[PDB]
């Protein structure tokens, strides 16, 4: 019952007891007074499979991590996401509620036996970390990987090589850890020759685990005066691997040494993170109050474990069905016949334009996350992660960090569930049929959207006057209260009461695709454009041009004069693109690991810059150049500005064909003569 405050929770050992399925784990606590403790947990085969969606002998032969073998998670990443989420569930289910950085009651065999909740806690101190390393990976081995895995991000190939020859991290140049002391370290070769004692404290604790018939001895590194780092994957890996090889030299027990990050998957992963779930004992956050708070709220498993923060994968079908049952049978028929491409509300069928009217755009902020949290409680009939989602929901509105998590959590929650999408899709449908039904009565006419974000024309307003704020206010209140009433009427209970945002009041709008809509206010020349790709800097200059062009074009209130303005805009755009005909980084597009240029072999020797390639590849073009796998400054043939302007002109021509068809009823697709005029500039 020491009143303390856990700073990190990290997996130390994972073994099978003498006899048989119930693998144990030993966890490391970084505890601080107003110290280093441990807890033991058991996990069954079923709980593991639940958090995975395989076998416990394959999660105890991940006790080959207690050695130089560096990236054992690359072998099977979801196995580690599983093992860590399952330990963090067993620990709350056996030791009790556990909350990083928060005041706590700790009842310690030396193993912490109970941790019930319970002082002003010590504010988390931060340590800065700058580290750089020169791993010598042979760039013909780094091309064999991508020969096997044609979409492989090269941070992954880099790590996979560092996995196939561990010794690359031994002979590798390599740190400056500032801690408010100072820890610099030369390493010409990291296996050869401030104090490592004023940065960490080496603690040995004696333990007597139930599933181990001996007085096991755990050696740890207790941070002093810092609780986390703030910041290269191969670089940190090899640093911490040196620390491990050094500390765990003499006879005692050896920790796990497992890390996870987007670099550990073949196809990458959009967001950066470096998940420590093993040896060192504390995180490395690669503002920063955001990562700190996300850490603390989701017990540090996010984004490491994925959607397993909220609820196991294969316990989602149950909640899906259960929540489905609680809904009103009309809504349930909606939830059962949802298919992604359906026309629920009649919308303005593009191409279409709305002229002088009191156009408005309202959005129900964070509705998808609110729905998921409510449907989780409705399907509840273990709930530690359900509470974690609700927590982010009640903070997301005012804490921006929580939003980024949900914006990735909700999509990733069904990046797995294939039927929780139907609950989301079907209840989404009912949320739209109301709003339509209420808009019938509040002088609003839904013109497009999805039901958490929508826009329409107030076709009763006098196209003028100050009695327009009043009507939009009445409409927003009516739709807020009606959508709230509907969601209640189905027993969906929302953490915090809906707010219907008013994200702008406009007076013209043109719609040219499903997602493509431009808005404009004639009273004050303010606009919004959505639906244009922003695949690079060229595309943001292009989007600015499309916005200014549409302002003039709707300032004309024939079609031919519009086409004159459009071709004038395209002309001036191509010329100003000529001024930037050398700027490679400007013409570079971002290409996902899913959208199919091949790699030059010369890029395979970009050294420690391949390790920054986890999601996007930024390519210019005719032959493709990954502008980031080469040192700076580039030395290039002329950039294929005709190829790139052709792409951009195709998108601008979608926009312009839409506007001409929608506003003036021209059947004429707008076309720009490029090969005829302005092609020569790039020949």
């Amino acid at each position: 019952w020491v009143e303390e405050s856990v700073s990190a929770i990290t997996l130390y050992a994972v073994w099978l007891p003498p006899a048989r399925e119930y693998f144990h784990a030993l966890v490391y606590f970084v505890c601080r007074n107003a110290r280093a403790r441990f807890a033991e947990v058991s996990v069954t085969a079923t709980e593991l499979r639940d958090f995975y969606g395989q076998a416990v002998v394959a999660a105890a032969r991940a006790a080959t991590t207690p050695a130089a073998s560096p990236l054992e998670p690359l072998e099977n990443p979801t196995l580690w996401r599983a093992l860590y989420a399952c330990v963090l569930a067993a620990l709350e289910r056996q030791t009790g509620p556990v909350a990083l950085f928060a005041p706590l009651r700790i009842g310690s065999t030396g193993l912490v036996v109970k941790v019930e909740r319970a002082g002003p806690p010590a504010a988390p101190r931060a340590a800065l970390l700058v580290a750089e390393a020169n791993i010598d990976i042979d760039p013909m081995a780094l091309a064999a990987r991508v020969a096997e895995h044609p979409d492989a991000r090269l941070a992954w190939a880099r790590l996979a090589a560092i996995r196939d020859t561990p010794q690359c991290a031994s002979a590798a140049s390599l740190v400056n850890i500032t801690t408010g002391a100072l820890f610099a370290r030369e390493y010409q070769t990291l296996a050869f020759p401030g104090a490592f004692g004023d940065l960490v404290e080496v603690c040995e604790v004696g333990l007597r685990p139930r599933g181990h018939p001996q007085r096991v001895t755990a050696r740890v590194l207790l941070p002093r005066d810092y609780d986390y780092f703030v910041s290269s994957a191969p670089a940190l890996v090899a640093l911490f691997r040196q620390w491990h090889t050094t500390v765990h030299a003499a006879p005692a027990l050896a920790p796990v040494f497992a890390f996870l990050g987007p670099e550990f998957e073949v196809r990458g992963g959009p967001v950066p993170y470096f998940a420590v779930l093993g040896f060192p004992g504390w995180p490395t956050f690669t503002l920063v109050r955001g990562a700190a708070a996300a850490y603390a709220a989701l017990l540090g498993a996010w984004p490491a474990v994925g959607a397993r923060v909220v609820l196991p994968p294969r316990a989602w079908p149950g909640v899906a069905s259960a929540a489905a049952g609680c809904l009103l049978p009309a809504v349930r028929e909606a939830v059962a016949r949802w298919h992604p491409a359906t026309k629920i509300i009649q919308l303005l069928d593009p191409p279409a334009a709305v002229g002088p009217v009191w156009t408005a755009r309202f959005c129900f902020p964070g509705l998808r996350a609110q729905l998921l949290a409510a449907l989780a409680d409705l399907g509840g009939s273990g709930r530690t992660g359900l509470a974690r989602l609700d927590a982010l929901v009640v903070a997301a509105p005012s804490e921006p960090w929580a939003g980024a998590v949900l914006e990735r959590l909700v999509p990733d929650t069904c990046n797995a569930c294939p039927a929780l999408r139907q609950l989301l899709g079907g209840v989404m449908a009912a949320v739209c049929l109301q709003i339509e039904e209420t808009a019938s009565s509040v002088k609003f006419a839904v013109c497009g959207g999805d039901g958490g974000a929508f826009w329409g024309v107030f076709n009763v307003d006098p196209q003028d006057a100050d009695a327009a704020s009043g009507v939009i206010e009445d409409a927003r209140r009516a739709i807020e209260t009606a959508v709230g009433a509907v969601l209640r009427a189905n027993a969906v209970r929302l953490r915090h009461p809906l707010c219907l945002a008013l994200e702008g009041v406009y007076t013209h709008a043109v719609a040219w695709s499903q997602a493509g809509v431009w808005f404009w206010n004639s009273r004050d020349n303010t606009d919004h454009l959505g639906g244009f790709p922003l695949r690079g800097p060229a595309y943001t200059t292009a989007a600015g041009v499309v916005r200014d062009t549409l302002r003039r074009v709707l300032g004309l209130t024939d079609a031919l004069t519009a086409r004159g303005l459009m071709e004038d805009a395209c002309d001036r755009l191509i010329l100003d693109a000529f001024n930037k005909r050398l700027d490679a980084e400007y013409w570079s597009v971002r290409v996902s690991p899913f959208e199919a240029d091949p790699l030059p072999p010369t890029a395979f020797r970009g050294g420690a810059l391949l390790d920054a390639e986890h999601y996007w590849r930024r390519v210019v073009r005719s032959v493709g150049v990954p502008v980031d796998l080469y040192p700076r400054p580039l030395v290039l043939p002329p950039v294929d500005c005709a190829h790139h302007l052709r792409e951009i002109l195709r998108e601008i021509e979608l926009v312009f064909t839409g506007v001409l068809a929608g506003v003036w009823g021209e059947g004429g697709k707008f076309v720009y003569p490029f090969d005829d005029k302005m092609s020569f500039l790039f020949a």
Binding site: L575, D576, F578, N579, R581, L582, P600, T602, V623, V625, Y630, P631, P633, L634, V635, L636, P637, P638, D676, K677, M678, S679, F680, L681, A683
Partner: protein, 355 residues
């Protein structure tokens, strides 16, 4: 007529660039402003075919970001705010681009290439340059007379100095109208007859030039047309000329096909001048006076002041109503007046197509 021919058989496309994009275009697609200003000695990349292929292969290693011999030399252009990419081959750091590339016939056989950032143009054209005093004292009023009298007066790194062909680089703009006359003739020709025939070449060709470049004050009296005759005529069988005209003021030409078209129009205009084909006919077997297929990318034209393995030396066809005769004589020596892609001497219009 000729108005009819350039009314039916040519389709101009021009694009009025303006402001700073004009300067950018000029600097980007023509030789650098010092590639053709003279210099004490050459900084360049001259070797035979094989050694040039090697030196290219050794420049690639220095070009790590770049992908990966007359396309590749002609390709190696850029600048940025650092030394250009050619500097890996030339091996200076104060090179500037775009810069010339030359094809060099070698005795007894074989071809060498030379991309050079600057050269000694006096070493090439001093034994052809008339002193300002000699002109100013030559005293001879009629311009046929003065032109004819003035004409009367007159290792790879060494072989470049007797045979040097300029390679067309379709990446680049064209600022000069370099015609390649190959008059084949049955009976020999005197020189006063040829000189007057060239005085009639210039007038017809300048009419064609003015039709093709409408917004240009191309006075057919003082507009410079620079003639070089390959070395009394004494020339039997074939009589090789070279006519170089500045592109008129606001224009620049882009394209191999655009300049093929310009040459063919000039051909038909001078064949439609009744004076020219009297003055020169009955000597001249064929009538195809202009090899319009010499403007293709990768193809080479012997430059004035270089022999063949006939030094193209000037025939001063002095303009009617010229103004500063010393300067017109001196321009037959500035390299800018006889390279395709030279710097021009507000807006510009780029004639990128004729059809």
């Amino acid at each position: 007529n000729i108005g009819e021919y350039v009314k039916h058989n040519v389709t101009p496309r021009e694009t009025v660039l303006d402001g700073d994009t004009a300067k950018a275009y000029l600097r980007a697609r023509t030789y650098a402003p010092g590639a053709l200003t003279p210099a004490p000695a050459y900084c360049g990349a001259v070797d035979s075919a094989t050694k040039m292929m090697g030196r290219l292969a050794d420049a690639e290693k220095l070009l790590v970001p770049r992908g990966w011999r007359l396309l590749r030399l002609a390709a190696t252009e850029q600048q940025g705010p650092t030394p250009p990419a050619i500097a890996a081959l030339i091996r200076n750091a104060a090179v500037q681009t775009p810069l010339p590339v030359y094809r060099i016939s070698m005795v007894p056989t074989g071809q060498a290439f030379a991309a050079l950032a600057w050269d000694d143009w006096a070493r090439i054209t001093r034994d052809a340059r008339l002193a300002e005093a000699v002109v100013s004292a030559e005293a001879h009023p009629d311009h046929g007379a003065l032109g004819r009298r003035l004409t009367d007066r007159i290792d790879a790194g060494g072989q470049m100095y007797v045979n040097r062909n300029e390679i067309f680089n379709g990446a680049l703009a064209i600022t000069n109208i370099i015609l390649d006359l190959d008059i084949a003739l049955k009976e020999p020709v005197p020189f006063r007859r040829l000189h007057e025939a060239l005085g009639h070449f210039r007038r017809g060709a300048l009419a064609a030039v003015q039709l093709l470049f409408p917004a240009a004050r191309v006075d057919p009296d003082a507009y410079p047309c620079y003639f070089f005759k390959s070395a009394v005529c004494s020339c039997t069988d074939k009589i090789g000329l070279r006519v170089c005209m500045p592109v008129p003021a606001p224009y620049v030409v882009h394209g191999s096909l655009t300049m093929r078209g310009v040459a063919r129009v000039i051909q038909q205009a001078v064949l439609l001048d009744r004076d020219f084909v009297e003055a020169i006919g009955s000597y001249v077997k064929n009538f195809l006076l202009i090899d319009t297929g010499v403007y293709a990318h990768g193809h080479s034209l012997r430059l004035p002041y270089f022999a063949k393995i006939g030094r193209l030396l000037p025939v001063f066809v002095i303009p009617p109503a010229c103004k500063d005769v010393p300067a017109f004589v001196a321009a037959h020596a500035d390299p800018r007046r006889f390279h395709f892609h030279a710097p021009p001497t507000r807006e510009i219009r780029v004639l990128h197509s004729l059809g």
